[PDB]
Amino acid sequence: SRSYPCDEKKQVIAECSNRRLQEVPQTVGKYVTELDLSDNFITHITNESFQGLQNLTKINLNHNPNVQNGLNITDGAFLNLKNLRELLLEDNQLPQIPSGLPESLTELSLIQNNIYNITKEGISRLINLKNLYLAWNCYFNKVCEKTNIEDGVFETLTNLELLSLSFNSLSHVPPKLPSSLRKLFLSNTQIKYISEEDFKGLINLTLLDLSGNCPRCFNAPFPCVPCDGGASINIDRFAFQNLTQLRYLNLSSTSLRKINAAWFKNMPHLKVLDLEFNYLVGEIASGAFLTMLPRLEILDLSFNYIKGSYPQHINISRNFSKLLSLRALHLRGYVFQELREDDFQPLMQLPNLSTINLGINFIKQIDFKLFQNFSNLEIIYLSENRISPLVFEFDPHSNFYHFTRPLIKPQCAAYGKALDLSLNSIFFIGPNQFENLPDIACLNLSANSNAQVLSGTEFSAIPHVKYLDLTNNRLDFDNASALTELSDLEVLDLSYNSHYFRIAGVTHHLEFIQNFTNLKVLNLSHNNIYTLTDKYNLESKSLVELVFSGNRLDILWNDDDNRYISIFKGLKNLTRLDLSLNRLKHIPNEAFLNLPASLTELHINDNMLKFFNWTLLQQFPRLELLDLRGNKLLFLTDSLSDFTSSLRTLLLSHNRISHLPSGFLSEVSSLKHLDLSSNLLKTINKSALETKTTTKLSMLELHGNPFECTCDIGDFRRWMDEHLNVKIPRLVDVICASPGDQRGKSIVSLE
Amino acid sequence: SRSYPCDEKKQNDSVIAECSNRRLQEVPQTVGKYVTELDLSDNFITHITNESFQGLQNLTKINLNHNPNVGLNITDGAFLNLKNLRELLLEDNQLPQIPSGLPESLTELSLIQNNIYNITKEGISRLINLKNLYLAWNCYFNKVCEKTNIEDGVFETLTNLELLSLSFNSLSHVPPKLPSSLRKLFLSNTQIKYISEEDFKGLINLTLLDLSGNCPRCFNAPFPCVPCDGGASINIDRFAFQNLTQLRYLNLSSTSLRKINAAWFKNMPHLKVLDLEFNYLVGEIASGAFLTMLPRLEILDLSFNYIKGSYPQHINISRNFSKLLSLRALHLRGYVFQELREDDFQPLMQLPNLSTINLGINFIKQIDFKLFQNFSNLEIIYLSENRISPLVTDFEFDPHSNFYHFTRPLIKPQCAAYGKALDLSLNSIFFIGPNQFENLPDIACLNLSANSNAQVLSGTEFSAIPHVKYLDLTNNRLDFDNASALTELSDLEVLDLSYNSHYFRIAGVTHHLEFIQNFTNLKVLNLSHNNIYTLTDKYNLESKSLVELVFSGNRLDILWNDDDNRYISIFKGLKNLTRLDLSLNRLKHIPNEAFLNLPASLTELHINDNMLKFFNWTLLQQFPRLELLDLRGNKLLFLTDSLSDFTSSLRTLLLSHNRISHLPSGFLSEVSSLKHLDLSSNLLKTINKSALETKTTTKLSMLELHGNPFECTCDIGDFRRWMDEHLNVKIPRLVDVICASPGDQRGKSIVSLE
Numbered sequence A: 001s002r003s004y005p006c007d008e009k010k011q012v013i014a015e016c017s018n019r020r021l022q023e024v025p026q027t028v029g030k031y032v033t034e035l036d037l038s039d040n041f042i043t044h045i046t047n048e049s050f051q052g053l054q055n056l057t058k059i060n061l062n063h064n065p066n067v068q069n070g071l072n073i074t075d076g077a078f079l080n081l082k083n084l085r086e087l088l089l090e091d092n093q094l095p096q097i098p099s100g101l102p103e104s105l106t107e108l109s110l111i112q113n114n115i116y117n118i119t120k121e122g123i124s125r126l127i128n129l130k131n132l133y134l135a136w137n138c139y140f141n142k143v144c145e146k147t148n149i150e151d152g153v154f155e156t157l158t159n160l161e162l163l164s165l166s167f168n169s170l171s172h173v174p175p176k177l178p179s180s181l182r183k184l185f186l187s188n189t190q191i192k193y194i195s196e197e198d199f200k201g202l203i204n205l206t207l208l209d210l211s212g213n214c215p216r217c218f219n220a221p222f223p224c225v226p227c228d229g230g231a232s233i234n235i236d237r238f239a240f241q242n243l244t245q246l247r248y249l250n251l252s253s254t255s256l257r258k259i260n261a262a263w264f265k266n267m268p269h270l271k272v273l274d275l276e277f278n279y280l281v282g283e284i285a286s287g288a289f290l291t292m293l294p295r296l297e298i299l300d301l302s303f304n305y306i307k308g309s310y311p312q313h314i315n316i317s318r319n320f321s322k323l324l325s326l327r328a329l330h331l332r333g334y335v336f337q338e339l340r341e342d343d344f345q346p347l348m349q350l351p352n353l354s355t356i357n358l359g360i361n362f363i364k365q366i367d368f369k370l371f372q373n374f375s376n377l378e379i380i381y382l383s384e385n386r387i388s389p390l391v392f393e394f395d396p397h398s399n400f401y402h403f404t405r406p407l408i409k410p411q412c413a414a415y416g417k418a419l420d421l422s423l424n425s426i427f428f429i430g431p432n433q434f435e436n437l438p439d440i441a442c443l444n445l446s447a448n449s450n451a452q453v454l455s456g457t458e459f460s461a462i463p464h465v466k467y468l469d470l471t472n473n474r475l476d477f478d479n480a481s482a483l484t485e486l487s488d489l490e491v492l493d494l495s496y497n498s499h500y501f502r503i504a505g506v507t508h509h510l511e512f513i514q515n516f517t518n519l520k521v522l523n524l525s526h527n528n529i530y531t532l533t534d535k536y537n538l539e540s541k542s543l544v545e546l547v548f549s550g551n552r553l554d555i556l557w558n559d560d561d562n563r564y565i566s567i568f569k570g571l572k573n574l575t576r577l578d579l580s581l582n583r584l585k586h587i588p589n590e591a592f593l594n595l596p597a598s599l600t601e602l603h604i605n606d607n608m609l610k611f612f613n614w615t616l617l618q619q620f621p622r623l624e625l626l627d628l629r630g631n632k633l634l635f636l637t638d639s640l641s642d643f644t645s646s647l648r649t650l651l652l653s654h655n656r657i658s659h660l661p662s663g664f665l666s667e668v669s670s671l672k673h674l675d676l677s678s679n680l681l682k683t684i685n686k687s688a689l690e691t692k693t694t695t696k697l698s699m700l701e702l703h704g705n706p707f708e709c710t711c712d713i714g715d716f717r718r719w720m721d722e723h724l725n726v727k728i729p730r731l732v733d734v735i736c737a738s739p740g741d742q743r744g745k746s747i748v749s750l751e
Numbered sequence B: 001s002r003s004y005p006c007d008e009k010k011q012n013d014s015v016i017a018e019c020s021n022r023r024l025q026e027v028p029q030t031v032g033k034y035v036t037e038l039d040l041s042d043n044f045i046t047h048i049t050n051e052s053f054q055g056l057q058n059l060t061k062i063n064l065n066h067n068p069n070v071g072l073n074i075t076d077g078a079f080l081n082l083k084n085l086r087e088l089l090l091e092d093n094q095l096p097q098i099p100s101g102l103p104e105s106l107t108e109l110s111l112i113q114n115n116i117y118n119i120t121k122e123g124i125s126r127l128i129n130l131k132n133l134y135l136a137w138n139c140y141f142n143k144v145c146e147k148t149n150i151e152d153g154v155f156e157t158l159t160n161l162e163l164l165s166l167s168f169n170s171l172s173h174v175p176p177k178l179p180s181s182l183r184k185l186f187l188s189n190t191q192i193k194y195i196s197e198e199d200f201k202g203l204i205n206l207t208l209l210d211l212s213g214n215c216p217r218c219f220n221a222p223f224p225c226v227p228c229d230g231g232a233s234i235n236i237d238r239f240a241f242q243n244l245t246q247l248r249y250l251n252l253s254s255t256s257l258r259k260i261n262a263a264w265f266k267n268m269p270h271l272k273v274l275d276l277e278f279n280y281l282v283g284e285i286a287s288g289a290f291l292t293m294l295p296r297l298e299i300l301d302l303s304f305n306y307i308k309g310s311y312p313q314h315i316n317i318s319r320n321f322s323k324l325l326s327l328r329a330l331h332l333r334g335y336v337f338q339e340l341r342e343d344d345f346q347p348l349m350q351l352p353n354l355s356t357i358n359l360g361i362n363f364i365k366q367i368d369f370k371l372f373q374n375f376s377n378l379e380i381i382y383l384s385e386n387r388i389s390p391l392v393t394d395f396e397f398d399p400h401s402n403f404y405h406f407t408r409p410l411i412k413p414q415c416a417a418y419g420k421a422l423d424l425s426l427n428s429i430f431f432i433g434p435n436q437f438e439n440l441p442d443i444a445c446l447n448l449s450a451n452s453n454a455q456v457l458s459g460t461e462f463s464a465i466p467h468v469k470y471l472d473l474t475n476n477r478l479d480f481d482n483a484s485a486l487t488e489l490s491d492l493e494v495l496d497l498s499y500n501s502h503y504f505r506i507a508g509v510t511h512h513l514e515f516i517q518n519f520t521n522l523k524v525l526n527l528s529h530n531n532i533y534t535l536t537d538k539y540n541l542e543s544k545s546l547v548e549l550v551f552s553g554n555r556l557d558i559l560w561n562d563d564d565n566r567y568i569s570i571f572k573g574l575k576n577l578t579r580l581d582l583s584l585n586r587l588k589h590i591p592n593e594a595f596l597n598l599p600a601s602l603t604e605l606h607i608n609d610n611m612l613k614f615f616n617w618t619l620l621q622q623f624p625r626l627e628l629l630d631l632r633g634n635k636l637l638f639l640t641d642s643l644s645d646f647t648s649s650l651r652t653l654l655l656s657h658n659r660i661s662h663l664p665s666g667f668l669s670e671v672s673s674l675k676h677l678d679l680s681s682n683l684l685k686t687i688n689k690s691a692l693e694t695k696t697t698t699k700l701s702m703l704e705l706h707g708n709p710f711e712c713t714c715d716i717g718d719f720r721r722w723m724d725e726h727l728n729v730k731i732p733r734l735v736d737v738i739c740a741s742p743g744d745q746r747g748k749s750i751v752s753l754e
């Protein structure tokens, strides 16, 4: 059995999602324990749907049906599944909690439905529930009803550890919550008041999310309903008195102006405090609560700006010096003109403060030397400011109030201390710009509209930069000594610096590249490179990877010009080369033969190639991956094994191949992965299948070929049957084009 | 009938068969006998014989350029029998020789871009009627080729020849015995180092001479370039042009000139256009005796005469520029200088007709702007690509274009049409301060594109030039945080804010587009590629005057998210709008109420290049003026069967690149207004009779169907017969209206099935 329609996988999971399925297939293996049927067109679940699949411990029916209208699940449809632990039913337009769910359930997700009634009948039998998600049923301008929570509905769920009720109209915290709760999410629930009773008994709670209740609505990116008068949430003095185990508290966008220090009296473990989108400028200056948090590691005070206010200075209370455990401080969107060394004195003896984030404050100048006086900053994040020369659209499973991606690309941060000055106005780097900074290893200058001629001295005060990002500037590469002060540079990103490269009449100089002794990775992408001055060749003894996408090799290698015929030959250590998006119609033979013999990976995808000289792979004895996707190729050589014994992956997707030559599936013993996706194949011929021996072939992609499903396809179908070790992904997309009665169906589905 | 494979055009005198770029392997035997011009360019034709055009004696013009695409073999005399052949284009055919036995009727012959190295009497000297002969670009750069041999006197018998183009061939000397009927002589890039008194002594009718690129200036060349020994100058004898009294055009670009002999111009009283780009003329520009000899000159191009590595404070223009009384345009790109002062341009200031001054690409850091007012009448002040800051076919080189510069207008004609133009694009005007625009003329057309401007415009910045009518602010970083922005510009008709994403992208900063309603005369607004998905307080765009809104490249998918009502009327307040562009907004579906709030005034609505799966046809009932609906590049499956119930205005419906697999019976019944229906690149297997059928006949004039996977069984018969009974409906590109199935038909046109 080659399984269909699902792909089976044993790290036993049937991946069956996004396959245009109309019903639960009756072709699922009986050894399957986890079934992913998300994103199909399934409209009915009955007690017949999964009979003879009782090993199932997990079912995902999210996002069904898509497109061309709700999911209809009968009473007790799942009841017979004795082992069902986890049921995901998100985005199914369910009007109610389905009835008669199995008591074995420990995890149930009903996120993004139309469920306005939470009943004993739905839920109170489900004694084994540990995590229950009912979020995003009624929010924003959706037409929906206030949520009715049957009194005591949650009381019998004495194993429940996580309950998520966010983005529903609740009005108050429900009573009779089980004391087993660890995590309680009540974001955006229209609760204006927290009483002493609401969480009095939840002694095991480690996370509480009360965000977005009484929101700050000015300039909201969503329909936002403030409390009367834009008032603050109202939280009783003793509301958190028993929450001794709280580690995470989210009070983002609760319109707070005042924080009651006493709220933290009994929270000796509190680790992450989110206070973004409030009105806390005054508390930041004078916060008594900061005195109550000596184990706090992450404090987010972002977007507490006063509307219309652009103060000279940020005002940080001396009490910040009590945050002895603080690791990250987020101060985006406070809005201020100038950062002086004195303004941050309270932060300067915190031993573990690693990250300071001052993104999006419209800061016009910074006294940079202040950063050295900190104990140990490793991320100095200043992106999106005004620093100039010195002289359903919300993911319900993510954080709603900010992105959670790293501030600094991990590959750069991995080198050491990081200074991110991206998206500023440092248009010219002058002699003292970088004076008195720490030993920066990772420097981001992307998008500073820098148009200068770097000349070998600009980075002299931080000469150990290992990863330099200069993307999206207007750099004028007119000096052979550029960047050469950076002896230890390993990664250099010059992508999107077209501005001068595109003008023929100005001089262009890339000779500095050869100076670096440790340069491993160079990205020259999207620079429109088509002409250089005097020195035509790129050279480096160390470089391993060159990204040359989005340039004009079609010009450089024009048949009437010899000058660039060795452009990459001097990159003597290169193993990875990217020549995508260079508008190539053909590569002269001599040009191809002058690519480095060291290559293991060569991409030439998304050009316009009409021919490819296969014989020339004889000069590339280490070549493992050749990527020719997105071209106009028609001809495959019929003696590939004469030209390579190294090639493992050949990517030929989105070309115009109509004929596979004799024994091509078995031509190259080393070939593991052949991608023939989206070409013009009508069949695969017997001679194409002829093998002298066996082959290393593990994966063959064929989806989007216009197959002719006559009896001519028989041979390949029988081949598929007898080579079950060759994976063919996406069989639902390996489709008959002709004739009319077969059109649209998988080739596997053919009598 | 309906012609195939070519498209025919009944033009004037002419009837033209457009037959190019059709993958043809043979000259087709199906060309109409009334055809006078045949364009076969860009096909896979390999052989021309005396049978190729047998049935086609009316042919006056044949284009065989660029054949075969992926050399062309022409038998001796293949064209001889074509008694009326006037024009033969044989460019880019890898010909090794001039074809033999060409008809004597020829008046126009192009052999541009071949491998022809011998120009013989036998090829050419019988062709007595030739008026234009093009032999350019046969041996140039690092092509493998040989020096051109021109048989002595080969051109002498061509006594009606007016244009001869020999550029981009290795010639070494001007050929002798040229016919005196010559008007235009092109000898660019021909490796001629010396011009003698004899070379053009008899060419008394010459109006153009091109000697560019002989002894070229090669520093930083964008092509393989071979200087004369020592990088010496072309050597032109004092009397080389003494008989050239009719010359209007002289191109001496890239001839390594340092010194210009005034006497060269003594007998050239009509000279109008002088190209001197890519020389070493900084010294002549400061002194230039030759400027005294050119009082009828209108265009002078001195671009890229920079001294290598030199960055002087000032440009030095001789006082002799004041003698160029007829001068209209002065091009001074690439001289390279830091500052332009008012004194530096005094010699130019009383020239009555000097309309255009071009200072592009000089790395200029400051300009004393007041100087431009003291000119008599500048209309184009071109300062693009400097350092101005706040005030305190396959061919690399198109052989049919100018090689030394682009020929496009300096200023977009739509902007220039309004009046005086100041182009400050691609500079460093990052902040517009209070006096930036002091002392300027009455600018009507203002380009500030790509100045990395990040400021909050606030209603006073353009106070000193308040009659700007066309404002280009594209590709900046503008922070639209003030409702009075640009409102000082009362007469503004066209405003381009494209590519100012920078702050629109950030949810947490405020965004304000309210200023738009203030303009009384605003007609065209372009907000493209701004990533607009959230505004502050005022969610709606309003204008009583605006006729055209370009909103492509924003996030209407977000603005019109089903859980948000706030932007449901975003465009309704554009009460005068007729053209709306919603392309590239990632839309999967448009809420019905949102669609219905688009202005009732629309005549043209584009929603192409989204991801639409649904389109509610019934809503075209509220758009009684709608003439063009463009839905190309979406994922639509369903067409309504009762389109005539919902519109009587629609003339063009563009549905290309969708997933339509069925034309409903009877789509098009009673929809009389529709002229142009584009169903190319969909998933059609056939068209049924009743799908096209109409009782009251229709205005249908164009139906596109190429790139559909047609099933060429007998099920296609009905459409084929329909095609034959509606010859007034054009179906273009019939070679691309192809059978997908079954195997024996696959690849063939549907019109080609018995």
Ligand SMILES: *[C@@H]1O[C@H](CO)[C@@H](O[C@@H]2O[C@H](CO)[C@@H](O[C@@H]3O[C@H](CO)[C@@H](O)[C@H](O[C@H]4O[C@H](CO)[C@@H](O)[C@H](O)[C@@H]4O)[C@@H]3O)[C@H](O)[C@H]2NC(C)=O)[C@H](O)[C@H]1NC(C)=O
Binding pocket: A183, A187, A207, A209, A211, A248, A249, A250, A272, A274, A395, A396, A397, A398, A399, A400, A401, A402
């Ligand atoms: C208020 O603040 C609290 C933190 O104090 C915040 O709690 C965090 O919420 C996010 C939002 O869901 C949780 O993040 C998810 O965690 C689960 C559990 O481990 C993951 O499965 C999620 O996985 C990601 O990748 C998956 C791949 O399968 C995807 O399926 C999915 O999209 C996700 O990308 C995801 O990381 C997070 O764990 C909690 N924090 C804690 C400690 O529990 C809350 O969101 C904030 N409130 C608002 C309204 O933003």
Ligand SMILES: *[C@@H]1O[C@H](CO)[C@@H](O[C@@H]2O[C@H](CO)[C@@H](O[C@@H]3O[C@H](CO)[C@@H](O)[C@H](O)[C@@H]3O)[C@H](O)[C@H]2NC(C)=O)[C@H](O)[C@H]1NC(C)=O
Binding pocket: A411, A412, A471, A491, A493, A495, A521, A522, A523, A525, A545, A547
């Ligand atoms: C310029 O090119 C460089 C080099 O290719 C780009 O950086 C590289 O980007 C890739 C992915 O595009 C990173 O690879 C990824 O790494 C992750 C985690 O290790 C892995 O999960 C992915 O499958 C993939 O391997 C690669 O590490 C990264 N390299 C470096 C040195 O940072 C860069 O993105 C390009 N610049 C621009 C503007 O595109």
Ligand SMILES: *[C@@H]1O[C@H](CO)[C@@H](O[C@@H]2O[C@H](CO)[C@@H](O[C@@H]3O[C@H](CO)[C@@H](O)[C@H](O)[C@@H]3O)[C@H](O)[C@H]2NC(C)=O)[C@H](O)[C@H]1NC(C)=O
Binding pocket: B412, B414, B415, B474, B494, B496, B498, B524, B525, B526, B528, B548, B550
């Ligand atoms: C911003 O949007 C405006 C308005 O659509 C764009 O300018 C307009 O560009 C089109 C070309 O796409 C011009 O129409 C063309 O005019 C010529 C000459 O008459 C005609 O030959 C073409 O078939 C077509 O009609 C239109 O005139 C022009 N309107 C102006 C300038 O007012 C503008 O280009 C967009 N900006 C960017 C950066 O895309």
Ligand SMILES: *[C@@H]1O[C@H](CO)[C@@H](O[C@@H]2O[C@H](CO)[C@@H](O)[C@H](O)[C@H]2NC(C)=O)[C@H](O)[C@H]1NC(C)=O
Binding pocket: A383, A407, A408, A409, A412, A420, A422, A423, A444, A445, A446, A447, A469
């Ligand atoms: C340098 O700063 C830029 C600009 O902030 C970072 O670019 C963003 O990075 C991610 C790639 O992971 C994208 O999803 C965003 O679109 C980028 N934004 C823009 C405007 O480009 C970049 O990654 C930073 N570089 C490093 C090494 O951290």
Ligand SMILES: *[C@@H]1O[C@H](CO)[C@@H](O[C@@H]2O[C@H](CO)[C@@H](O)[C@H](O)[C@H]2NC(C)=O)[C@H](O)[C@H]1NC(C)=O
Binding pocket: B384, B410, B411, B412, B415, B425, B426, B447, B448, B449, B472
């Ligand atoms: C203002 O200047 C910009 C930049 O010079 C112009 O953009 C050019 O437009 C031409 C013709 O439309 C394009 O082919 C070029 O690619 C553009 N150049 C660049 C760098 O983008 C724009 O046309 C000018 N605006 C006006 C009104 O003339």
Ligand SMILES: CCCCc1nc2c(N)nc3ccccc3c2o1
Binding pocket: A453, A476, A477, A478, A500, A505, A506, A507, A508, B304, B306, B311, B333, B334, B335, B336, B361, B362, B363
């Ligand atoms: C018209 C430009 C001639 C050659 C040239 N290339 C450059 C170049 N790339 N940068 C320059 C910066 C300042 C001054 C002159 C520059 C220059 O000159």
Ligand SMILES: CCCCc1nc2c(N)nc3ccccc3c2o1
Binding pocket: A303, A305, A310, A332, A333, A334, A335, A360, A361, A362, B456, B479, B480, B481, B503, B508, B509, B510, B511
């Ligand atoms: C954190 C952003 C808060 C709201 C805001 N939007 C903008 C905005 N768009 N521009 C600003 C310019 C200067 C100072 C504050 C600005 C501002 O503040």
Ligand SMILES: *[C@@H]1O[C@H](CO)[C@@H](O)[C@H](O)[C@H]1NC(C)=O
Binding pocket: A324, A325, A326, A351, A352
């Ligand atoms: C700082 O971090 C280190 C471990 O990463 C730790 O041992 C020490 O306890 C922390 N200091 C404080 C003051 O919390």
Ligand SMILES: *[C@@H]1O[C@H](CO)[C@@H](O)[C@H](O)[C@H]1NC(C)=O
Binding pocket: A455, A456, A479, A480, A481
């Ligand atoms: C690069 O710049 C430095 C001055 O910054 C200069 O000394 C050196 O000559 C420059 N290199 C070249 C080739 O001009």
Ligand SMILES: *[C@@H]1O[C@H](CO)[C@@H](O)[C@H](O)[C@H]1NC(C)=O
Binding pocket: A484, A485, A514, A515
């Ligand atoms: C850069 O490399 C070149 C040539 O290899 C050498 O002449 C130059 O001095 C080098 N300079 C530095 C600072 O690395």
Ligand SMILES: *[C@@H]1O[C@H](CO)[C@@H](O)[C@H](O)[C@H]1NC(C)=O
Binding pocket: A517, A520, A541, A542, A543, A544, A573
């Ligand atoms: C070549 O690359 C390898 C892997 O990065 C590295 O070990 C070696 O140091 C490089 N060689 C040279 C000569 O720099």
Ligand SMILES: *[C@@H]1O[C@H](CO)[C@@H](O)[C@H](O)[C@H]1NC(C)=O
Binding pocket: A589, A590, A613, A615, A616
């Ligand atoms: C492939 O390469 C060499 C030239 O280096 C040549 O001998 C062989 O004919 C080539 N194939 C094609 C189609 O050019």
Ligand SMILES: *[C@@H]1O[C@H](CO)[C@@H](O)[C@H](O)[C@H]1NC(C)=O
Binding pocket: B050, B051, B054, B081
């Ligand atoms: C073509 O030329 C040859 C003379 O070589 C003659 O035999 C033949 O009939 C000619 N064909 C036509 C169609 O004129």
Ligand SMILES: *[C@@H]1O[C@H](CO)[C@@H](O)[C@H](O)[C@H]1NC(C)=O
Binding pocket: B325, B326, B327, B352, B353
């Ligand atoms: C200036 O141009 C006008 C209009 O073309 C023309 O009549 C006049 O002769 C020109 N003046 C000079 C000095 O050439």
Ligand SMILES: *[C@@H]1O[C@H](CO)[C@@H](O)[C@H](O)[C@H]1NC(C)=O
Binding pocket: B458, B459, B460, B481, B482, B483, B484
């Ligand atoms: C716009 O900016 C100007 C600065 O001149 C300021 O006076 C005005 O109040 C601002 N208007 C708004 C609505 O912010």
Ligand SMILES: *[C@@H]1O[C@H](CO)[C@@H](O)[C@H](O)[C@H]1NC(C)=O
Binding pocket: B459, B484, B487, B517, B518
């Ligand atoms: C702009 O538009 C509205 C017109 O209703 C008005 O309130 C506002 O004051 C106008 N502003 C200026 C600066 O003209």
